[PDB]
Amino acid sequence: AQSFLNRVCGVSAARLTPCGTGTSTDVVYRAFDIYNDKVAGFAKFLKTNCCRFQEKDEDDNLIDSYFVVKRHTFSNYQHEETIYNLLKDCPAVAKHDFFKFRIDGDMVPHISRQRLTKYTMADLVYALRHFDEGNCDTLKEILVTYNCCDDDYFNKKDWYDFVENPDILRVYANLGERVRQALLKTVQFCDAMRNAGIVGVLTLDNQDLNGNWYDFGDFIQTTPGSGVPVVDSYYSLLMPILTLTRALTAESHVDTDLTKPYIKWDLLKYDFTEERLKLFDRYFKYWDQTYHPNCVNCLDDRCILHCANFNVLFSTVFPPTSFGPLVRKIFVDGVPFVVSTGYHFRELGVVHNQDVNLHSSRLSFKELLVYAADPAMHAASGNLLLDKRTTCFSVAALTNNVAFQTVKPGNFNKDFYDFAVSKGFFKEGSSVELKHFFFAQDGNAAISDYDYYRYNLPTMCDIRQLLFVVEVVDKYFDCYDGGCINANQVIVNNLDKSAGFPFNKWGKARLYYDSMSYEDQDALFAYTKRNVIPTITQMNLKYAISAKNRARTVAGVSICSTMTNRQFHQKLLKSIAATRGATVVIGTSKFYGGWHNMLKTVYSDVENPHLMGWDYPKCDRAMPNMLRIMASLVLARKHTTCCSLSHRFYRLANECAQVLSEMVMCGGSLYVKPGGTSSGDATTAYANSVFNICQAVTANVNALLSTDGNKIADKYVRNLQHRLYECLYRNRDVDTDFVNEFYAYLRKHFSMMILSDDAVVCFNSTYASQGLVASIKNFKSVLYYQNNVFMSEAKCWTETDLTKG
Amino acid sequence: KMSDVKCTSVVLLSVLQQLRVESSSKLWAQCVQLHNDILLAKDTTEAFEKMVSLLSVLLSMQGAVDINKLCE
Amino acid sequence: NDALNNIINNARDGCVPLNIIPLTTAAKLMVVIPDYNTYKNTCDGTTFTYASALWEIQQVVDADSKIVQLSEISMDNSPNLAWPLIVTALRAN
Amino acid sequence: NNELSPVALRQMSCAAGTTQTACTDDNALAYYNTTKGGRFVLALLSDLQDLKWARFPKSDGTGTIYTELEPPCRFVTDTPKGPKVKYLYFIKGLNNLNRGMVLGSLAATVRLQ
Ligand SMILES: [Mn+2]
Ligand SMILES: [Mn+2]
Ligand SMILES: [Zn+2]
Ligand SMILES: [Zn+2]
Known part of the structure; x- marks a missing residue:
């Protein structure tokens, strides 16, 4: 009847309005995170048993707060009652209310919670990590409700885009405070659970956006002072959000309040080792895995990943004028120099040089090279520069006047044109027509293209999923061999190319590859294994035919970098390029029937195939730093x-000091490259392949995890889902048996062909139509929440008749 | 017919560039902008007005003696 | 300069970041302004303050690297100038 | 649903002590993770207050592994023997999840007051 409604409201704010039927339930689609003994996943299930009421604010207007009430059994009732009685005094728990009502002649029990919010955090995280601009209604509602934007904003089409409409960052960043408060109240909930002696597993689908918690349904009780919270899935699923919305932006104000001035850090202070641990202890107190503020203490590669992930987030709070080399005044032959004696990355902490020799007597040729390539001596003796054309952090000016470089137009070969028009070509209405021309560029063309690095944002990665995608990508590369090679074995073509800055003032690469005997090069290559050598990269424009008027800019790295990188990497690089039948197809020629062999390779044994390809929009500049690091690892x-x-x-x-944040010398003055690959280094064409395979594996993982595991009919793929979630989140160490299992599944149902970011995929289709493998939308979602670019469907094609390739 | 316009815009920009027109930044910016729009045009009539605008730049100075160069 | 030695002595370890040496010892500042609107907010008048110091404007030049006097850069006269203006200044005490 | 640990692992006995050589014969109980790529016990269940080293010879028998232990945990159960206060000892470096599994299994199949 109606006494139900006046019972629910209890004591406070009896402004109850039904939000559906009466004494019956209310079924809605919400995103859970389920793991019982039959199903895993992070998927939208059908929540059924809850009656939802909405409160009325004054003036008879509907307010954003609800009174949910479940209806379930009798043992869960008392169990819940005991756990709530224990956990009531915490500020971060929403007020329950247990009562017995009657529908027919029986006391059905209820849990009439109070003052909710319509959505949990799971809906926010799912909708941001599983985007589909065709239907993003939940994101629209969540955005408008919390005053981040207004409905009129979504009439501006391509609103969601990141390249177009770069203002969407200002819309997303308005959600920072809610997430930060959720973090803090989660910490307080963990403290209450520990001190109360309760053992339980935490999910995001049991936390309204205000911060409070509920559903103490699957908890168990231990002796007080000895409880344990389980936060592996919660934090790891929530990782990618904390840099989309800049949830830590309120940590640079004087007392961490948004209505205060900024903290003025000291200019020279560069350590920030205590601050990082304080932040970790405040926000991630119960992340029970050692976090080393400086990665030079790490034990192996996976720990380096696990600590670089945290340093990425914690380095966006400290000032950007303290990063970079940490120079020191060194006396040589009675003269003071300024030379780099370390580094300070955002992703690796402080790294100190091991072999530094102050009061040196004389400099060898190796010393002269390693001192004429460091930016310290150059920048520390140049005039300041404040460039308002760019948003990238300028550093200094080596000269007194900037230089403007233009791009000339290509010349005309008239005789061939006359011959073409003689043979009845270029007639109006013909299919063949001129489209590839030599475009021209005005004075400030170089800097207007360097400015495109503004599309690079500090990104967090889901670490407990990367620590598995990296295993599978590793297994993709177990067919080849590699190792360090001596100076007398490197192979270098075209020895008369430029030697970078400032070496291009004296001669081409031949001179510097010539003056060093086969012992100087090995001395240098063994020096760099205990030291850090920053370098200065020049930036040049290409002069080639094209179909688009945008310029192209390529980085000429200095000789001291590629000279040692060749020795380090060349064995593996030339073992990749001399293999046939693999996934990567670098080195396989299209002549003499090679293309036919490649196409018949990728069609290998899939059952109901369908082609699929793509390419990445501005691949080199939209590259996050974590994926570059993982590729190099x-x-x-x-x-x-x-x-x-x-x-x-x-x-x-x-490598990180030379191809990730090296001081690009664009024009006539040094700048700071924020991130992304420099395309003119030694290992670009293979780092891109590693990236591409990583995205493919991540798309497969997301597509298999996020499926409702109660409709899957083939038993084996369901067991694959369950074990996949187990080894992803409920585990800590590599399980090579299951890594082999998953790699076999992939190479049997997802065939691939890769060159440097230009891929082709042949997939079983009757699976992809049930979401057991990556479709072409999954790559859109992954690129969205991980690469910060929106993948337009005018660049991804899909083909179904294999007779045409 | 438009292909002839694109080709003549290319050669016109080359002769303008070797006439040392890039010493004044604004003029070179206007010239390169017009040339880019001519090359990317899809129809003939706007190509021709941008063409005459671009040719007026060459006619403005006195470096290209026209009566001799027009020898028929 | 003695300022470089001064800021290198005050470090706890003698190692200071590279991105503060020019910021706190440079004797000349170069600005690049794309349009008059940015010029008004930053290099307004014969003196301006950046990096918590005092500078005096001197030898304003345009893209063609020809000297432009300060009175010319008005609102209405702006469209008659090459406009990557490079404004130089020196550190005042 | 997100359940803690479906099904329990098992119980056995093992050897422990106070120092490297103080490892006597069977003096505790261990719940173990049954993995195909090696053997891994989870928690040391004992009555003596200040055990600090535990030991178990390798399956080959040539080698033997020492397992340092964290500070103990105080808890009791209900049995025909009456109030019988044991100390739960965890291997050092045990992660939170396995603590949850062992504690859930203990509280499920064994009484506590
Ligand atoms: Mn729940
Ligand atoms: Mn529940
Ligand atoms: Zn570490
Ligand atoms: Zn090696």
Whole structure:
């Protein structure tokens, strides 16, 4: 009847309005995270047994707060009652209310909670990580309700895009405070659970956006002072959001309040080792895995990933004028220099040089090279520069006047044109027509293309999923060999190319590859395994035919980088390029029937095939730093015997100092490259392949995990789902048996062909139509929440008649 | 007919560039902008007005003696 | 300069970040302004403050690297100038 | 649903002690993770207050592994023997999830007051 409604409201705010039927339930689609003994996943299920009431604000207007009430059994009733009685005093628990009503002649029990919010955090996280712009109604409602935007904003089409409409960051960042408060109240909930002696597993689908918690249904009780919270899935699923919405932006104000001035850090202070641990203890107190503020203390590669992931987030709070090399005044032959004696990354903490020799007597040729390539001496003796054309952090000016470089138009070969028009070509209405021309560019063309690095944002990665995608991508590369090679074995083509800055003032690469005997090069390559050498990259424009008027800019890295990177990587690089029948197809020619062999390779044994391909919009500049780091780690993994563990870490640090944040010398003044690959280094064409395979595996993982595991009919793939979730989140160490299992599943139902980001995939289709493998929308979702680019469906094709390739 | 316009815009920009027109940044910016719009045009009539605008730049100076160069 | 030695002595370890040496010891500042609107907010008048110091404007030049006097850069006269203006200044004490 | 640990693992006995050489014969009980790629016990269930080293010879018998233990946990159960206060000892470095599994199994199949 109606006494139900006046019973539910209880004591406070009896402004109850039914939000459906009466004494019956209310079924809605919500995103859970289920793992019982029969099903895993992070998928939208059908929540049924709950009657939802909405409160009325004054003036008779509907307010954003609800009174849910479940209806379930009798043992869960008392169990819930006891656990709530124990957990009531915490501020981060929503007020329950247990009562018995009657529908027919029986006291059906209820849990009439109070003052909810319509959505949990699980809906927010799912909708951001599983985007589909065709139907994003839940995201629209969640955005409008919390005053982040207004409904009139969504009439501006391509609103969701990141390249177009770059203002959407300002819309998303308005959700930071709610998420930060959720983090804090989760910490307080964990403290209450521990001190109360309760053992339980935490999910996001039991936390309204305000911060409170509920559903103490599957908890168990232990002795007080000895409880344990389980937070592996919660934090790891929530990781990618904390940099979409900048949830830690309120940590740079004077007393962490948004209505205060900014903290003014000291100029010279660069350590920030205590602050990182304080942040970790405040927000991630119960993440029971050691977090090393500086990664030079890490034990192996996976710990380096696990600590770089946290440093990425914690480095966006500290000022960007303290990062970079940490120079030191060194006396040589009675003269003070300024030379780099370390580094300070955002993703690896502080790294110190091991072999530094102040009060040196004389400099060898190796010393002269390693001192004429460091930006410290250059920048520390140049005028300041404040460039308002760009948003990238400028550093200094080496000269007194900037230089403007233009791009000339290509010339005309008239005789061929006359011959063409003689033979009845270029007639109006013909299919063949001129479209590829030599475009021209005005004075400020170089800097207007360097400015595109503004599409690079500090991104967090789902670490407990990357620590498995990296295993599978690793298994994809177990067919080849690699190792360090000596100076007398490197193979270099075209020895008369430029030597970078400032070496291009004296001669081409031949001179520097010539003056060093076969012992100087090895001395340098063994020096870099215990030191860090920052370098200065030049930026040049290409002059080639094209169909689009945008310029193309390529980075000419200095010789001191590629000279050692060749020795480090060349064995593996030339073992990849000399293999036929693999996934990567670098080196396989299309002449003499190679293309036919490739196409018949990728059609291998799939059952109901359907082609699918793609390419990435601005692949080099939209690259996050974590995926670059992981790609370099996967490439350097093969050195299990030739190098130690400190040597491998210092080589990785050198790579990050040379191709990830190196001081680009664009024009006539140094800038700071924020992130992304520089396309003119030694291992671009293979790092891109590693990236592409990583995205493919991530799409497969997301597509298989996020499926309702009660409709899947083939038993084996359901067991695959369950074990996949188990080894992803409920586990900590690699399980090579299941890694082999999943890799076999992939290569049997997802065939691939890869070059540097230009891929082709042949997939079983009657599975992809049931979401057991990656479709072409899954790559859109992954690129959205991980690469920060929206994949337009005018660049991804899909083909179904295999007779045409 | 438009292909002839694109080709003549290419050669016109080349002769303008070797006439040392890029010493004044604004003029070179206007010229390169017009040339890019001519090359990307899909129809003939706007190509021709941008063409005459681009040719007026060459006619403006005195470096290209026209009466001799027009020898028929 | 003695300022570089001064800021290198005050470090706890003698190692200071690279991105603060020019910021706190440079004797000349270069600005690049794309349009008059940005010029008004930053390099307004013969003195301006950046990096918590005092600078005086000197030798304003345009893209063609020809000297432009300060009175010319008005609102209405702006469309008659090459407009990556490079405004130089020196550190005042 | 997100359940803690479906099904329990098992119970056995093992050896422990106070130092490296203080490892006497069977003096505790261990719940173990049954993995095909090796053997891994979870928790040391004992009556003596200050055990600090535990030991178990390798399956080959040539080697033997020492397992350091964290500070103990105080709990009791109900049995025909009456109030019988044991100390739960965890291997050092045990992660939260396995603590949850062992504690859930203990509270499920064994009484506590
Ligand atoms: Mn729940
Ligand atoms: Mn429940
Ligand atoms: Zn670590
Ligand atoms: Zn090696």
